[PDB]
C-alpha cells in the first residue's frame, strides 16, 4: 500500500466521492489541511523550517 494510494488520488477514478486528501510532502490522506495540501506534521515541519509564507508562529 501507500505507493498505490498516491496513484488513486493522482489518477482520480470515476465518481466524485472516492476522493480524499493527500499530504504530497509526507504522504497521508487524513487530517490534511486542503489549503496547503499538507498533513498536520507536514504543515508543521515546513512551518518550523522557516519554509511557510504568510503564516506565523501564532501566539494570541
Amino acid at each position: 500500500a501507500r505507493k498505490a494510494l498516491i496513484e488513486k488520488a493522482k489518477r482520480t477514478p470515476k465518481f466524485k466521492v472516492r476522493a480524499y486528501t493527500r499530504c504530497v510532502r509526507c504522504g497521508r490522506a487524513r487530517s490534511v489541511y486542503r489549503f496547503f495540501g499538507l498533513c498536520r506534521i507536514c504543515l508543521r515541519e515546513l512551518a518550523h523550517k522557516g519554509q511557510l509564507p504568510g503564516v506565523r508562529k501564532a501566539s494570541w
Binding site: 489541511y33 489549503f35 498536520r40 506534521i41 504543515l43 508543521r44 512551518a47 511557510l52 509564507p53 504568510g54 503564516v55 506565523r56 508562529k57 501564532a58 494570541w60
Partner: protein, 99 residues
C-alpha cells in the same frame, strides 16, 4: 475616483508602499486618499505536537495577509505614467478598480 486596493503579505513594504505611493501621486498630480487600512486578513490553523497520537498539547499558526487602500481624484498623464510602472512589490500585489 481611483480605487487602488493593496493585497500584501507583510505590513512592512505594504505601508512602505502606502507612503512613497501617496507622495508621488501628490507629486505628479493632486489630492490622494491617505493609505486607509482594511482589517488585516488572518487565517487560523490549529495543529498539534508530534505525529504520535497526542490530541492535546498543541501549537497554533496564523496566516497574515494585509489589505490597504489608496485613492486619488484626477487622472493626469504624469501621475498615471509614474505610478503605473514605477513599482517594486517583490511580495505584494494590488487591485485597480473604479467607482
Amino acid at each position: 475616483k481611483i480605487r487602488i486596493k493593496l493585497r500584501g503579505f507583510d505590513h512592512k513594504t505594504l505601508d512602505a508602499s502606502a507612503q512613497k505611493i501617496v507622495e508621488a501621486a501628490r507629486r505628479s498630480g493632486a489630492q490622494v486618499s491617505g493609505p486607509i487600512p482594511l482589517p488585516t486578513r488572518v487565517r487560523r490553523f490549529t495543529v498539534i505536537r508530534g505525529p504520535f497520537k497526542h490530541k492535546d498539547s498543541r501549537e497554533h499558526f496564523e496566516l497574515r495577509t494585509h489589505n490597504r487602500l489608496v485613492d486619488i481624484i484626477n487622472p493626469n498623464r504624469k501621475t498615471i505614467e509614474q505610478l503605473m510602472t514605477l513599482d517594486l512589490p517583490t511580495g505584494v500585489e494590488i487591485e485597480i478598480k473604479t467607482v
